[PDB]
Amino acid sequence: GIEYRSLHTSQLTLSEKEALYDLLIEGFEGDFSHDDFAHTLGGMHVMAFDQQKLVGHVAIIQRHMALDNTPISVGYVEAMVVEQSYRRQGIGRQLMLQTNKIIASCYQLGLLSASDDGQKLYHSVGWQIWKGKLFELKQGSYIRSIEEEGGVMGWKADGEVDFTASLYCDFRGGDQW
Amino acid sequence: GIEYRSLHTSQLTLSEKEALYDLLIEGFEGDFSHDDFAHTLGGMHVMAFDQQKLVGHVAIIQRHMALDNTPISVGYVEAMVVEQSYRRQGIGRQLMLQTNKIIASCYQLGLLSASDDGQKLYHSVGWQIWKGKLFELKQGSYIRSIEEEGGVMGWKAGEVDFTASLYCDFRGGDQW
Ligand SMILES: CC(C)(COP(=O)(O)OP(=O)(O)OC[C@H]1O[C@@H](n2cnc3c(N)ncnc32)[C@H](O)[C@@H]1OP(=O)(O)O)[C@@H](O)C(=O)NCCC(=O)NCCS
Ligand SMILES: CC(C)(COP(=O)(O)OP(=O)(O)OC[C@H]1O[C@@H](n2cnc3c(N)ncnc32)[C@H](O)[C@@H]1OP(=O)(O)O)[C@@H](O)C(=O)NCCC(=O)NCCS
Ligand SMILES: CC(=O)N[C@@H]1C[C@H](O)[C@@H](CN)O[C@@H]1O[C@H]1[C@H](O)[C@@H](O[C@H]2O[C@H](CO)[C@@H](O)[C@H](N)[C@H]2O)[C@H](N)C[C@@H]1N
Ligand SMILES: CC(=O)N[C@@H]1C[C@H](O)[C@@H](CN)O[C@@H]1O[C@H]1[C@H](O)[C@@H](O[C@H]2O[C@H](CO)[C@@H](O)[C@H](N)[C@H]2O)[C@H](N)C[C@@H]1N
């Protein structure tokens, strides 16, 4: 009974972007900042609808990272949310199945930063904890992303990505992961 | 009778992706590498068609850069091409008008790397030579992108200082 649509940010209306913001604010219970919203704009949105009402969302952002010394094209997962009264029905799983398809068609590696509880959902669609060190840019130089190690997860089904290598992410505002 | 379509890489049929490869190889007369092709995948494609034949293309890739110390979200233009026999009919201009729309809706700044004899097209839809320093990552440290200074152009729908420094994100091949 839930319909799924994949739309680029450039294909959304202002009202649809606003409904997305509203869904994220309500679904994260105050844990979602203006920088977090910036992070979810510019790539592909997978949106779940009950009739015309938006009830679920995940976005896939293109990021450009280094894996040890090697450049790697990343599909970075942002702003995963399902409206509270619609949870535990499998919507989040369906959103990730669509997310995996987009990543497989476009990028060398999927990455996301998960809450300690939220890891089971991603693990159930094949994602694994990233085992290597994580780095981010601060004032133009790389530092260790100590707080994120153990929480970042990756995916590339049937690929040859070394999950024990270091990742060096690209720069943004707010949380870099 | 040229039709324009905007399609994410994830929405391209396999037929469209192969047609795109051929169009780029034929249109750039040998100066388009496998890294250049990797660079045009992962974002939005604006494609021009004569009936069912692909005859023009431009892609807009999301990149994450620094403007001086400030993080900025960039729409980066890649793989601009029109099949030779279709050129000088305004297709490239229309591709760029569509590109400007996509950038205005998604990103803080448009950037591209133009050839010395190929800046007039972008200038005619509002783009300007970037006047500040350009930097790229090598060995995980930023170095100057001297080659590109005077060739990279930017566009803001806007309050952006074109004399500020740009620090791009990492990739294979040409960083710009
Ligand atoms: C995380 C989130 C998006 C999951 O959305 P969801 O639609 O509830 O995800 P699913 O329903 O596919 O699976 C969720 C759980 O319900 C369970 N479930 C799904 N369908 C079920 C059913 N018919 N009967 C019983 N349990 C079911 C799944 O097994 C899973 O259990 P697990 O937590 O042990 O894996 C949602 O809780 C949310 O929006 N949280 C707030 C924002 C947030 O934390 N986002 C993620 C940041 S990492
Ligand atoms: C650059 C390129 C994409 C332009 O495609 P195009 O469709 O020819 O672009 P337009 O036709 O809109 O404009 C092209 C020229 O014709 C002129 N023109 C525009 N409309 C015209 C018309 N209706 N009749 C005649 N001339 C016209 C433009 O002013 C421009 O003149 P300039 O060469 O002095 O800028 C094409 O030359 C190409 O594919 N080159 C090879 C790949 C390449 O170099 N890409 C860009 C790298 S920066
Ligand atoms: C896949 C996804 O949708 N991800 C969302 C994006 C959203 O924009 C953001 C809103 N805030 O939340 C998630 O991403 C956060 C992570 O939640 C956060 O993790 C901390 O918070 C968790 C829950 O409190 C703790 O479990 C965890 N140990 C702790 O490190 C990371 N540090 C940064 C990362 N951007
Ligand atoms: C907007 C656009 O579609 N851009 C294409 C992308 C394409 O993937 C690539 C294929 N190769 O070409 C263009 O982008 C190149 C630039 O052409 C190149 O410019 C050098 O080559 C020019 C022509 O010889 C010289 O004029 C110029 N001085 C010289 O620096 C830059 N260094 C790197 C940059 N990725």
Residue numbers in the entry:
A (entry chain A): 2 to 178
B (entry chain B): 2 to 158, 160 to 178
Paper text:
AAC(2′)-Ia is chromosomally restricted in Providencia stuartii, an opportunistic pathogen responsible for catheter-associated urinary tract infections with a high mortality rate. This enzyme is a part of a larger group of AAC(2′)-I isozymes, which includes five enzyme subtypes (AAC(2′)-Ia—AAC(2′)-Ie). Specifically, AAC(2′)-Ia utilizes cosubstrate, acetyl-CoA, to detoxify naturally occurring aminoglycosides such as kanamycin, tobramycin, sisomicin, and gentamicin, as well as semisynthetic aminoglycosides such as dibekacin, netilmicin, and plazomicin through the addition of an acetyl group at their 2′ positions.
Meanwhile, the crystal structures of AAC(2′)-Ia in complex with CoA and acetylated aminoglycosides describes the enzyme in three product-bound states. While the aminoglycoside portion of acetylated-gentamicin only hydrogen bonds with AAC(2′)-Ia via three residues, the tobramycin moiety can interact with up to 7 residues. In identical fashion to gentamicin, the central ring of tobramycin is anchored by two hydrogen bond interactions, N-1 with Glu149 and N-3 with the C-terminal carboxylate of Trp178. Additionally, both aminoglycosides interact with the backbone carbonyl of Ser114 at their site of modification, N-2′. Aside from these interactions, the prime-ring of tobramycin also interacts with the backbone carbonyl of Asp32 and the side chain of Asp37 at the N-6′ position. At the double-prime ring, tobramycin interacts with the enzyme at its N-4′′ and O-5′′ via hydrogen bond with Asp117. The tobramycin molecule in chain B also forms an additional hydrogen bond interaction between its O-2′′ and Glu148 of AAC(2′)-Ia. The acetyl group modification of the molecule interacts with the enzyme by way of the backbone amine of Met81. The acetylated tobramycin in chain A also interacts with the backbone amine of the adjacent residue, Ala80. In the tobramycin-bound structure, there is no chemical addition at the N-1 amine, and therefore Glu148 can adopt either conformation.
